[PDB]
Nucleic acid binder design. Structure first.
Length: 122
DNA sequence: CTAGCGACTAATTTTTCGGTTCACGGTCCCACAACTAACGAC
């Protein structure tokens, strides 16, 4: 900005507006309605996992019991539906990896990924 | 629970080869066609 190679941002109107973790409250699992309930600044909200009884199902419960950390999230609205962009802080996964073993990856427009690993081609 | 704060395409021309025309001093073997000399009938 001192030299000048960037214009001042002109924010759009459909922006997902941000809300901090200091606003999530009354998080519980109401079994009667089969949906998590919470308040986004004094308004009830039934969460629609739908047919997602495993993927993010044990993620909100990982927060109702205080086991996963959440960051300043955002919220989108796309014409009747409402979406929450929750920045959950997930951890790394440890496998049985060998640093000496090297995978040779190449990316081209004819073959998006071509990978060598010893005698294994993918 | 909320608020303050850290140049490419089409049209026209021209030319070599083919077509056409004129038209006087060995062997051995198995069949097939003659064929003829003799034989029998009228």
């Amino acid at each position: 900005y001192w030299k000048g190679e960037r214009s001042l941002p002109n924010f759009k109107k459909d922006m997902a507006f941000p809300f901090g973790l200091q606003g999530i409250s009354r998080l519980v699992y109401d079994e009667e309605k089969k949906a998590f309930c919470f308040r986004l600044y004094r308004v009830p909200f039934k969460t629609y996992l739908g047919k997602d009884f495993t993927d993010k199902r044990m993620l909100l419960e990982r927060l109702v019991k205080g086991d996963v950390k959440l960051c300043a999230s955002n919220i989108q609205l796309n014409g009747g539906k409402i979406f929450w962009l929750a920045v959950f802080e997930i951890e790394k996964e440890k496998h049985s990896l060998k640093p000496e073993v090297i995978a040779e990856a190449s990316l081209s427009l004819e073959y998006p990924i071509v990978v060598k690993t010893g005698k294994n081609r993918l």
